[PDB]
Amino acid sequence: ERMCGRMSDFCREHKTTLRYIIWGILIAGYLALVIAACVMNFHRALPLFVITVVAIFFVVWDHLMAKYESQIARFLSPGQRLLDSHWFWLKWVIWGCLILGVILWLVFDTAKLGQQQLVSFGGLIIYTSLTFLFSKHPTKVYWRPVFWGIGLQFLLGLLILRTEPGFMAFDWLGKQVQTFLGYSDAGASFVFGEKYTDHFFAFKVLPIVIFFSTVMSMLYYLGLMQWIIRKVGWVMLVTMGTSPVESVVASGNIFIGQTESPLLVRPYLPYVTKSELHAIMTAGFSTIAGSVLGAYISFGVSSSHLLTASVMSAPAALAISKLFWPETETPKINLKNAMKMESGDSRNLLEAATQGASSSISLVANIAVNLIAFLALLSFMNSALSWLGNMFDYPQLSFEVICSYVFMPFAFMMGVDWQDSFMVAKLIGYKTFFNEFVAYQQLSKLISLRQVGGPKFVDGVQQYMSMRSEAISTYALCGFANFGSLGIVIGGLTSMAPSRKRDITAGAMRALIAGTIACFLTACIAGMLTNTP
Amino acid sequence: ERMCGRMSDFCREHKTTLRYIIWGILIAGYLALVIAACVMNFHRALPLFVITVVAIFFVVWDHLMAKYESQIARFLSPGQRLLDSHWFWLKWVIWGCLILGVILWLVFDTAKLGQQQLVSFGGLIIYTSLTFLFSKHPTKVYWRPVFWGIGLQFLLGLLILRTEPGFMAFDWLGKQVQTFLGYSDAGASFVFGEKYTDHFFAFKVLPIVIFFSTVMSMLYYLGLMQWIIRKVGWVMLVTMGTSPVESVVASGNIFIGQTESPLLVRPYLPYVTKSELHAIMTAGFSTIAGSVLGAYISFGVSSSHLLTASVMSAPAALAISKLFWPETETPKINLKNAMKMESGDSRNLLEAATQGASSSISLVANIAVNLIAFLALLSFMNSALSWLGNMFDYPQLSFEVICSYVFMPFAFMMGVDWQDSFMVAKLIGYKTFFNEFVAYQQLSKLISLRQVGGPKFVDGVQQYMSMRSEAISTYALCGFANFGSLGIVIGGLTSMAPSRKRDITAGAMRALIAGTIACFLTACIAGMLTNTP
Amino acid sequence: ERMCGRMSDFCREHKTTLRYIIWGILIAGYLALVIAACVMNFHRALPLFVITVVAIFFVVWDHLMAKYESQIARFLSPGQRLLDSHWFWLKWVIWGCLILGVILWLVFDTAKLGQQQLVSFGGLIIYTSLTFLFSKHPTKVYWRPVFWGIGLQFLLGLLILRTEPGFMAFDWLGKQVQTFLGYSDAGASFVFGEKYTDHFFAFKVLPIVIFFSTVMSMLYYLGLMQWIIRKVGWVMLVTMGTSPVESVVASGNIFIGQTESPLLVRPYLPYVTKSELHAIMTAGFSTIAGSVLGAYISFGVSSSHLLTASVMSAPAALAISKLFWPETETPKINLKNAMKMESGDSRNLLEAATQGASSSISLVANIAVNLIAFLALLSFMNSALSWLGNMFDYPQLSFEVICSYVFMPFAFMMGVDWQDSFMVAKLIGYKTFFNEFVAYQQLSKLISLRQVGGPKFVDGVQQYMSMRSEAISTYALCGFANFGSLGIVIGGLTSMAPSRKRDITAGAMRALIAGTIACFLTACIAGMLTNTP
Numbered sequence A, B, C: 001e002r003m004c005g006r007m008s009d010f011c012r013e014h015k016t017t018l019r020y021i022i023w024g025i026l027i028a029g030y031l032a033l034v035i036a037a038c039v040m041n042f043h044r045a046l047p048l049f050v051i052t053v054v055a056i057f058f059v060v061w062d063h064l065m066a067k068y069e070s071q072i073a074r075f076l077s078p079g080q081r082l083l084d085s086h087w088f089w090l091k092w093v094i095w096g097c098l099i100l101g102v103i104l105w106l107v108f109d110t111a112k113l114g115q116q117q118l119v120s121f122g123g124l125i126i127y128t129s130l131t132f133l134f135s136k137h138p139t140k141v142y143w144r145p146v147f148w149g150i151g152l153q154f155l156l157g158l159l160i161l162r163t164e165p166g167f168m169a170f171d172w173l174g175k176q177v178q179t180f181l182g183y184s185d186a187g188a189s190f191v192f193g194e195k196y197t198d199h200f201f202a203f204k205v206l207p208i209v210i211f212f213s214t215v216m217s218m219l220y221y222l223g224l225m226q227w228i229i230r231k232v233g234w235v236m237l238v239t240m241g242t243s244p245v246e247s248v249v250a251s252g253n254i255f256i257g258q259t260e261s262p263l264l265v266r267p268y269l270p271y272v273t274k275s276e277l278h279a280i281m282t283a284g285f286s287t288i289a290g291s292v293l294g295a296y297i298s299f300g301v302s303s304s305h306l307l308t309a310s311v312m313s314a315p316a317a318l319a320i321s322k323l324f325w326p327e328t329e330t331p332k333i334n335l336k337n338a339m340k341m342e343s344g345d346s347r348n349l350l351e352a353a354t355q356g357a358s359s360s361i362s363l364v365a366n367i368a369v370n371l372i373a374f375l376a377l378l379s380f381m382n383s384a385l386s387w388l389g390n391m392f393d394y395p396q397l398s399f400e401v402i403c404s405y406v407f408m409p410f411a412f413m414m415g416v417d418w419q420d421s422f423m424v425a426k427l428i429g430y431k432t433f434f435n436e437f438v439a440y441q442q443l444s445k446l447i448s449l450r451q452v453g454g455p456k457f458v459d460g461v462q463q464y465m466s467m468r469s470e471a472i473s474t475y476a477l478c479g480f481a482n483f484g485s486l487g488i489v490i491g492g493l494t495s496m497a498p499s500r501k502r503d504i505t506a507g508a509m510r511a512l513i514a515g516t517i518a519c520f521l522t523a524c525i526a527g528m529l530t531n532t533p
């Protein structure tokens, strides 16, 4: 086998150049395809050219930052020194300018829009005051992260809701997801036949969850998700000054679920402080996964609003966590350790797809079993309350009626008008007690009722609410927080970090309340930026 | 934060009085609601008043027993001493009176009712004799528990089947469960659509199991189930003189499945004796779980009879366990240890509901798969026996035909008339060989056929049986005793108590036979108390 | 209890004779039934008589071989010595005779049949040459197993495809399975109602898998499967000279899935060599399981061809494993250790049935979820490729179009004609990239399209292929070899043998390629033996 030996020696001698040449040939072929498509027709091939240009730009940027980090840091250093030297007097000027800008924006936009947006701003202030008053360590509050998170939320709201470029970009991004969720019909029709639409939810919606889980697993294998998570987490860390671990987990929670987000920093969980653990739990409670976004879109909820709320939740979660439970210890983990995210054990893309598919079985089973149990309990409770109510000549007593009054003040502070606050209170109660699926189902019912165009009041009962109220409800309901998800979170986090069982249990309720408050703050900003039609 | 410190000091100083005052205010509000409902209309608010009165009575009784236990015991002591002093001669008088009462009841009721009830009594005697003859230690039999269990069964049968108060109470209780099982339709319609009735069993019956599991978990969290179990177990322990652990497990098995009832005494399992272990297994085999009651009621089986058999099974299970495998060791566990039941790790009611919901997944999956496999095996066996039978010009040979003859003597001793004994034998075989679900499905088929009113014989084949025979079959079929559950029972019990693997395996078959015999004894009593229409 | 003591003493004294007498009485009863059936009518009772005769013959044969092994070996020894003495010169005569026979068969059959069978033979030669060239140790090849496996495949093909007895036997065997898979409808109708056919795959096909899993578990409990596996494994071991462990695992893989076949030799896995491990993995990848045979038959794939491919795969798998990764170590395990197969922990037949039923839950769930995910990914990829293709005025670009050209050379070497090679390439790609379920679904689509009789070309697109091409595709697609199962295979094998994790990972890809090559070799033989209609 002399030929085999010679071939092996050749491969060993120049292994690096051979694979590099192969990759270069593949890249050249792709570029040739792109240029040929552009030559044949440019308007038709524009999106491919844009994607290629942005990919090349990001690759070059990443390479340059990796290679010239020290030089750039040294070049930036003198400016930082001068700014530190002049900061003692420049801070007052900067703060005064920011306050003046806030006042001018309020006076010239919010007052023009109407009273409800001013009420939204007041509700944001009140939620922040309430969070501060019931803080774990009111005297140890570091105010930089809170104001920076609120400012980042406000900037995102202005960019996405008050500008044509951002509005078009997010409308397009939402429209793409609707196209993407339709592909699961191919599998659903085969597995469940052409009559799979006879049982809409079980045989059409859950397959969307399965497909999205599979796609998320494939993306995680490809490493794009860690790239985006690192970008957003670095932005938050440099702006808000938060710890690398909590910043990374908050950025990840935008896409990944509550129970699978901490796995990004699993090795370092035992050494985190109490504040970081509370922030991790708050971020988990304040966002929704990407697996269960197609399910919400299928009901009829706006995709653009869901994406915007998911993006805005992370800074809100971090700010509310820092205000509610400020840091009183020294963080141990560093940026390099936090940013490295151990990828899963998948040998190839198809194995990653199969692993993502397999994991969805438990998720889709629980999603249906919990819904069955909660809807049965709701029907039983409504019947029991009607039975009790009839003894006072009030057989209309129900869970919805009680929620309409208990949670109305929370909806009013978010900027919902008086009439629609009682309807939003019912959704708030549904989310708080059972889960977000039950609340989004009712929200989709109301959206469809409005879109039909029928009478708004029948026998004195309001049938649907305004579109701004619907948007505010969508922002408020975008989370994983409910009184029934505390046990699974505690169990999973203890399983990842058994030594920290005592600490995990202590802050879980505060993290859940912080998540709800962060969702309400995002809803407050959305309400204060939207206009009354 | 001086105000925060002062508030914390105030809370710490008088924590006990603050929560007590809050609870008192809640109780006062509830009482105000009840009295207002009664004032506005009394006949309409009667059940609420009754529930409040019984709850207050039980709370006061429990408090008094807890506080004045020593005083009551001391007050009772002299009477016990006098009774012990005179017992050597009073025992013959008491036993003679009981025997005379039994004879008088037989002569003046059973003979009047007909021959079949005398046959039921003879079958009860024969089953007890057979249990004694094949006993593990025939010379070590303690006869108090056997006679006390039989007497308690007879008293329960007289109270429930032969008196208007008990009959009305149990009919009402059964009717309430039928209303309760309808609530799962709310979840079933949403998850599976409005066409969920196109697949009746999978999309309507199993959700009832899920909802019942959720409700049972919520009740166990609330602690009412332990209260009722403790009451019934104390009654049995004081009457039959059984060990606290076995009494508690028998009482619990009325509501809880065989595989979860032992969890009530999990810490003390390693120290139980062989007789207690056999009694635990017999009780598990002799009763059903509350989660599957809804499916049986949905098939069409009488709810009142199911509840009565479930209640009567526990004393029968304990008596048959004690007779078949009497105690030859010294029990180690005491009443206080047996009665304390470590509750689950649920932080709030909604978490308990979600945990109950999640557990039901495997239950329903196993039920569906087992039914599919058993029905396919039944069809294959029937086809194979028809193929074999045709070689003797008897192509009618089938599993049902063989069962009609093999198990007919067991049905006849239970008091079923000659014609219907062969039909009950088929149900007995179905239960013995596959499970109680198929036997109850066939029983529901027969009940529906009778209720239609069609011809009783078509081409010489009997289509349905009498209602007394149906009741006797319902009593006989109430149990999880089948050859296929021996493996799972042994696995679960060994998992709870690994050290006792050798002992668990030894008595499992005897416990299964004891459970079947206990079910047959309950059927015998039901038959001897029912009348021929 | 003197009577009980005497009975126990009697039972202990003559335990062996009592059970032997009972078994003899049962056997006498069975023989009486058989003889009576034969007397009443012989033609009607013929199959029962045949089954009884074959069972008696096999029992007597097994007893004689067990009892007289040493005597038979000694009697055979002198002939072996003479053959060894004369082998140095007789080997050339034997090899020349075999080569002449091969040449004569080629010239007088293959040339007559047509060019395509000669191309199949050339493809077999090319596949063997390619396997040799890329071998792990090309200089350590032991050529006995390769030639013996190829000869055994050729003999099986001649017996089953070129003789009336074998053809009738295998057609009958396939027809029996079609009858057997119909029994699951009894359970499916009850669990899913009479409308279970509204969702054909989920509510009719998976229950077949459940029933087949249950039947396989019952057979494994009964010990017939080990009997057959031992017979086939001894045949392969004596002919090919393979190690006992690899022979036993290859024989078992004919009926058992890749993930459960190694459990037959679980205790001895840690001491196997690298070559044996590679052979185990190749055998697992080169065959299908009996649980999924029913689904494939339900789709419309020929049952006889599936059975023949499953039988032929084992020698092909072993030969390709030995050629690709030859043995360079000393095997430690012996025949006696390999042949003993520790049975499962099932106390009775019904418990075995329930355990087989329970295991099927994850199998069917994973099948359904993987199918949904793969079909959704296929639809998304087809849409993306159409979007990319339209930029070159070729919107017809698709995954199928690319596969039709990428894998066409593999199909052509198997003997498929030029036109149908492109269609077989699509099925090859489907199997390689997602699984064998989708490829078989497409094959059933094509088979139905051919069986309808419509036009073969519509607008220049071929609709269906010849029946010989369908048979070759059926042979080629019989295997669990796909990129997505590498992870689960490695995980399961490491779980069984944690110490061998490093060795398991190294050879998994080579074992998958060897399995694919073995499937292609079986397809090559099937093509070279079939005729063009």
Ligand SMILES: N#C[C@@]1(c2ccc3c(N)ncnn23)O[C@H](CO)[C@@H](O)[C@H]1O
Pocket: A256, A257, A258, A259, A260, A289, A290, A291, A292, A363, A366, A367, A435, A436, A437, A480, A482, A485
């Ligand atoms: N279980 C679950 C959940 C869910 C949805 C999506 C996920 C996910 N990606 N990872 C873990 N959980 N998860 O369903 C409820 C309603 O949507 C929620 O409260 C979650 O508890």
